[PDB]
Design a protein around this ligand. Structure first.
Ligand SMILES: O[C@@H]1[C@H](O)[C@H](O)CO[C@H]1O
Ligand SMILES: [Ca+2]
Ligand SMILES: [Cl-]
Length: 287
């Protein structure tokens, strides 16, 4: 009897994606839907399998945080041709008019906020390293660009390594160990996301370099807690919970009478998190 909404994200070991799934699930059930929550583990084939499952089960809409900007177009198009609309969150696909919605953070704006804080904490000088996200995710390059466009105004600041750790805490730890051995004179690390920042601060701490300034991106409870404890200095909040709920609200409107948002692509504002507002943050929302 109940209509079904399928929710598909990357693995829940990154709290960002878990929070999206829980937010979407909550809104779906609040509006009378049953839910089917699946993970694709950043694997396009697994994402294909999961969308087939949504189709097979008769989902009325799919909420998707995708497995690659290019690779995901065909999957979303498969669902579409099966008569099932997709409402994308967090990550864009490199196509318009396929998804009904793409509701993402303003990544360039956000990244600039975090870089501005990084520069301030750095006193406009010194050697730093950058950890970059997954090449398949347009968010990785957009954030890097925003960071670069701030930091390139400060000639005394110098990047001594720029490496991908693929949005992975464990990869970030290992990369940081190697980077730190090559570059003992680093003053700071700026990271494209919070799981990489957690890996970095762990590696720094284990090397006895607690003085190094780390700035992340996402606003997770884990990084909040680090900020509160004097670890990481700042992050940038993406409204993950609200974004997932908005996607479901749009899906429900569409299911009900084919209301579509005026603009497919929608941006949500980011907010800088630091010691002054970390205590107002919980599960990707400020109060
Ligand atoms: O926006 C998300 C989050 O930053 C996550 O932590 C990594 O993937 C990005 O696309
Ligand atoms: Ca500039
Ligand atoms: Cl891709």
């Amino acid at each position: 009897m109940a209509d079904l909404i399928a929710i598909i994200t990357p693995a829940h070991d990154n709290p960002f994606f878990k929070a999206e799934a829980v937010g979407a699930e909550a809104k779906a059930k609040e509006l009378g839907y049953e839910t089917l929550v699946m993970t694709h583990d950043d694997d396009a084939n697994k994402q294909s399998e999961m969308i087939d499952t949504a189709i097979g089960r008769g989902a009325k809409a799919i909420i998707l945080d995708n497995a690659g900007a290019d690779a995901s177009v065909a999957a979303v198009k498969k669902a579409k041709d099966a008569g099932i609309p997709s409402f994308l969150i967090d990550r864009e696909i490199n196509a318009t008019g396929v998804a009904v919605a793409q509701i993402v953070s303003n990544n360039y704006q956000g990244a600039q906020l975090g870089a501005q804080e990084f520069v301030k904490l750095m006193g406009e000088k010194g050697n730093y390293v950058e950890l970059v996200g997954k090449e398949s995710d347009t968010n990785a390059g957009i954030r890097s660009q925003g960071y670069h466009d701030v930091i390139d105004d400060y000639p005394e600041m110098k990047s001594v390594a720029k490496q991908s750790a693929n949005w992975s805490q464990t990869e970030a730890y290992s990369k940081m160990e190697t980077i730190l051995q090559a570059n003992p004179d680093i003053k700071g690390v700026i990271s494209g996301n919070d799981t990489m920042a957690m890996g970095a601060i762990a590696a720094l701490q284990a090397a006895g370099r607690k003085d190094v300034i780390v700035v992340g991106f996402d606003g997770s409870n884990d990084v909040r807690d680090s900020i509160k404890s004097g670890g990481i200095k700042a992050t940038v909040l993406q409204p993950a919970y609200a974004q997932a709920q908005l996607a479901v609200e749009q899906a429900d409107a569409y299911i009900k009478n084919k209301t579509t948002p005026k603009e497919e692509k929608q941006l949500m504002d980011c907010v800088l998190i630091n010691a002054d507002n970390a205590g107002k943050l919980e599960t990707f929302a400020l109060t």
